[PDB]
Design a protein around this ligand. Sequence first.
Ligand SMILES: O=C(O)CCC(=O)C(=O)O
Ligand SMILES: O=C(O)CCC(=O)C(=O)O
Lengths: 196, 196
Amino acid sequence: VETFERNKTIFFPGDPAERVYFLLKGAVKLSRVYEAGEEITVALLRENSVFGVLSLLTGNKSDRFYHAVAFTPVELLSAPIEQVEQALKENPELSMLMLRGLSSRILQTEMMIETLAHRDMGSRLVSFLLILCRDFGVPCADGITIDLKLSHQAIAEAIGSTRVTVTRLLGDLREKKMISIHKKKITVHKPVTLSR
Amino acid sequence: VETFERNKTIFFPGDPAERVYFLLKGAVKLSRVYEAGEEITVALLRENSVFGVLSLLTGNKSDRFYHAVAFTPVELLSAPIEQVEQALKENPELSMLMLRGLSSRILQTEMMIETLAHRDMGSRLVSFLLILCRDFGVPCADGITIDLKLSHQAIAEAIGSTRVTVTRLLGDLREKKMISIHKKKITVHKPVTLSR
Ligand SMILES: O=C(O)CCC(=O)C(=O)O
Ligand SMILES: O=C(O)CCC(=O)C(=O)O
């Protein structure tokens, strides 16, 4: 069981795709990185996700092109591909469960496609927040607290927007009392009604 | 082998998720259908993709929420979920090959997250076409031909835009001599350079 301090890198673009990973605790951010250091978020992975799947294809013969970061303190398992490939070719059942895990990854990414497809950033934001509710939400008298520290920057990198825009949108959502924010934990007040 | 005419439905929202599918020839469109009747594209699957993967999660106890349509004339295989779990037992190797196809689906979806992430609708379109060039590309004296009838509406539904805007953007690109269109098939003239 490995641990990663918050903001520690799990793999860098350019690193051989040596291992597969399983996320026990915390959130992992996958992103694409650009020459100047800008990053675009491509996935925010929730507990119990398999990831690093490019090694399931090319194994260490190929290089990472996304950046994997411990978005919160993380705990995870990982194993070179042949170790995995052995464990599978050996334990048939296990594979049925990784097939399920991968199927989940795909359905989750497609939900982000849906979030990103909205033309107006306001809905893009609510929709992204509703997903986080589901992935990391904690029940509350108000509604649901997204148990992650979310900077305006981090949100911008994930819904395709600038930070200034996120700030304005977030302020608008509070003015209207659909959300509260405290030390970066966002609480969504009426999740179910927001899925309108 | 099951064939489907262009624009025929392979599976509708509400259907039991009982089968896994394999795409042999053509392109399959996955969408979310909305209350009104508008449709948002979540994936354009290319030949040799596994899909319907919701059925490897629950199976019957779960109803399709996406719409699977033959975007071009299509041929595919399919099987009841419990038959898949069986051949998985039989051939612990076939297993790995599913794992790998699922891995590739994940990566393909993430690459669409990147497309949608662009703020500049022009760039988002160029990026969507590059995808199409590698997914449905055919080498050309002129560069790479995307082998698909693409209406502006269809492009709009996949890049979170509208017909009108797509028409303007395609024309801009054509003025720059950057793409060509014949019979609704688009040719991208220097895709390797554009990748910039
Ligand atoms: O596997 C990689 O190299 C990038 C994408 C990824 O980590 C996955 O979503 O599992
Ligand atoms: O499995 C479905 O029901 C929806 C998503 C899907 O078809 C997949 O991308 O393979």
